[model samples]
Target: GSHMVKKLRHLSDGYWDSAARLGVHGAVLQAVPGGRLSAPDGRVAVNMSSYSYLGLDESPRIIDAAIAALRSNMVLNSSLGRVRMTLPLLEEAECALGDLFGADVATLNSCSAAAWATLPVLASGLLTDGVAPVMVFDKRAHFCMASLKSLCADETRVETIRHNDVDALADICRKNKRVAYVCDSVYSTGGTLAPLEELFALQKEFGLFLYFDEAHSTSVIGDMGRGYVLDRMGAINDSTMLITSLNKGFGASGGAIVFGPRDDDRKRKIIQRSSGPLMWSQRLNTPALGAIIESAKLHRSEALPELQAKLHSNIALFDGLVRAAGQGNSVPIRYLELGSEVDTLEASAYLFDNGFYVEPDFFPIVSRGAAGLRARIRSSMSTADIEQFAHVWHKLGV
Candidate 1:
């Protein structure tokens, strides 16, 4: 315990302390009209740091739904989902989500909370037959899932492999009787993707268990926005599990875990009854649940395809002007690879000064040498804004 504390302190002091001094890590901002944000002193910038790829955050329909729920007196439930009487609206939202994603779904307050509740249970071998599967995590998996490594290790053997390293994962599977691979369908930082095809092949050959966090990809890709993993796989299977964030592309609050069609009821019952967050954490409030229901309706409508097309067009337009790591991909995140932290910070500052709010990512968020400016493409951003941002980015010439 002492050694771990010392190491954590060193990490924070050595990296975060200096990064915080730059005044780029955290900033207070107020939302403004047209998907923009204003700094405390009234400086406004186009929001490129947000994860709302489809721009549903500002949807009038969603806003109205929240208001309606509030007006209906559906506020706090103030009880755990395990023992408390389930709200009808919560049940309706879960059913809508299950229909939309083609799986049995359970909602949680956040993806982090969902991870904390589910990963340990999975590691305990209760989900599988009777043997605890060795847990293998991708190096580039989101911190929400990776942070539970120590807890998972307590239940079973834990291993880490290079990002999307299917061959290494296959080797692990060869040695272990049962192996569960955990990864993000779409990586959050650089917008890279897992090698789903190769991993699926491994699953077929080894009967491997797969756990995916589709937070970045949910409601952004796939038909009806089922996300990258479900799009490729068509439907959830018995051996696979998915957790997605409604707070991102879904344009709502909270997260959800999707289970397979065959054993979904049993799995859902287990999680609802035993998972810590589902049992004790506050259920998603009425307004957020209202927003989720409305968002799911919009997702099922024709409007989603139009918004997706616009987002893809914007990504293509930005790629045409500025070449970045995620160029030519449907995913909305792009990173301009400026090598040094100082250089990246300077470039980001210049963008902020010029009415753009691209985030500067440094050591900890990414590798030290891989520091760069991270920009998220949103469907709501007009073509003119994209062109102007590209023009300004080139002017920096970093």
Candidate 2:
């Protein structure tokens, strides 16, 4: 049977109640075998938890490129943060990603490490300016900047407005004199698209610099299969920054940051010194970066259009099915809008019993009592698979 989070949650509570009390966490599927989960009738379960929107993880195109990278590259592991001679693939991938995002520069690093550098450095105010840090972010941005507010050398306060509320964001932002707004193109849990255009407008109108976490936005949105923000908002220009993981949409390893022309000095400084504590501890997982670099061809190849189309269509079909099932209305679901926590969970358990493995997120993932099933659509699943999924879902009254 497909594992629901609560199944694991309750399992943990019984097996290791102490850890559960201390918040011991576990996965529904990680290294387990036999598809990690299955239906009672022995069919491979329909996987709904995957973020591989383009289905790149199982695609031969990218996997073959990964093999080629492993075979052709001068692979080397450096001491923590030493200046290692990286494969040419890293440079090529960075260039391709930068071009894909329409930014002037792209620097490669692991995701969290990218934040470790960005938060303190960008928010630090360049010593010469002598100002403390202030980060204005969507209340739901990833944990990196949230951690920085506590750890950075200077005084820092991070303010959050409602999840993607533009008016509240503007209200909170207008009060800060020096601030950097950080966000992701799409929030992860429910695949919510951020009010990026609004944030960009705020950036220009208020003289704030923007930083983005594109982990979930990689292949799912934008032109040339670039990312959520860079594609939606167009060339980052002088006001924005993008950081993304290689493992998400791109189906590679490692991570990167893209910046506009205006931050060239800072970019150069970081890329060079990126080897220190910031780069050293994280040490740009070279194998993954190489795989991602080689897969850049796949990310940009002609095949991507078909894959992108597949994701777009799949997401549409999912939304349509949800509406048709009467689980929600056809009124377009935005961030955290699916109502009635009990009904949502009842519907979710309805889906769970049928064969789909999904995350039933609650407080902290959203406000208390606002929890619901977050269904992430991926293109890897076939149209027939989606129709079958809907049929099973409807049969169960999801």
Candidate 3:
């Protein structure tokens, strides 16, 4: 075990060291106008590593709300949410989000915290009908959820199926009395999506429970930014639980757990009462709550669809030139496989030098040998900016 740990540590160290040497990772940047960032030395690059798919992160309305909350003496409530007197804005923001998604919503500090808090409860069958369901995770689920496997295993049996392999999931469901499958609606690294329709079919056929992290898709897809899974499902059903990040496409800070219409607050109450993370961790700050409220308003306004259209147009433009994974989709993330960590780093450095900042994905982020560059397209990026980026990308013969 120690040797295996050492080997993994060494691989990470090598990648970090190489990236540091090449001056591509951990870049200290300041946001510039027009969705650009500037290095300390004044080199500017189009921001392609951002998760703000609709560019709401820079929205003046949301920023104003956050500042107003701060100016209004919205204290950073330090006590755990379970014990502290609830903030009115917290409840207000939750209500706004609930209205937007048409589901019962509970806010947390982050998607990571939401997963850490709730996965164990689901695994222990506290949310289920007394018997702990066998936990099955998709192989490519985000690490935030996947890292909790051992933790969940402590509560119930845990298994992993190949990425998006519904047949394997079905077989497990066929054999088990109860099964819960964990996955992402839109994967963060490669921008690939879970097969929601097939998974929903399994949910119908075998009573499979779904725990989806829609962090990447929230605020970027679906009507009123209800997200990929909820949009496709029409509504959150009794068998599904969704955790999404407000900081991503939603243009806000913090994360939330969304329960289906049939939940009636029972599952949410159980999580709030029993989940260690929720009971112990500090709640979302007042500013975050304010931002969430305003962002939800934006999601319900005419601006959301306009921003989404711009995002889709930008995505199509980039895909037209680069032909990367997740091409021809409204999903904003794209991956260009370059085959080696060194090559990926070199490519990222080249992009950085050419006024574009794209992140390099290597081991642990992707499979051992599938190092690549991950780019996030945003609605804020102008057509010329994307055209220039694509031109530079093609110069590398990728």
Name the best candidate (by TM-score): 3
Give the per-residue lDDT of model 1 (tens digit) for 261-335. Answer: 843588777777875887888888888888999999999999999999999998899989889888888889988
lDDT score, candidate 2: 0.59
Which model is ahead, 1 or 3, in terms of lDDT?
3
Cα lDDT of model 3 by residue, 1-398, tens digit: 00012344688889988887887877678988788988889998888878888998899999999988777864765454545668778888899999999889988899999999889899999888888999999888877888788888888999988889888888998898999999999886666789988998999998899999989879888998898888889978788999988998898999999866734888887888885777878888888989999999999999999998998888888888888877887788888888888899999998899998888998766777899888889999999999998899889777
Q: Which ten residues in a row have the lowest lDDT in candidate 2?
A: 325-334
For each candidate, what is the lDDT? 0.84, 0.59, 0.86
Best by lDDT: 3
Clash number by candidate, in order: 0, 0, 0
Instruction: Please report, as a residue range, the 10-residue window in candidate 1 with the lowest summed lDDT.
Output: 1-10
Question: What is the full ranking by lDDT, best candidate first?
Answer: 3, 1, 2
105: Cα error in model 1, Å: 0.4
| Candidate 1 Cα deviation (angstroms), residue 155 | 1.4
State candidate 2's TM-score.
0.77
Please give the ranking of all candidate structures by TM-score, highest first, separated by commas.
Answer: 3, 1, 2
Model 1, residue 282: C-alpha shift (Å) = 1.0
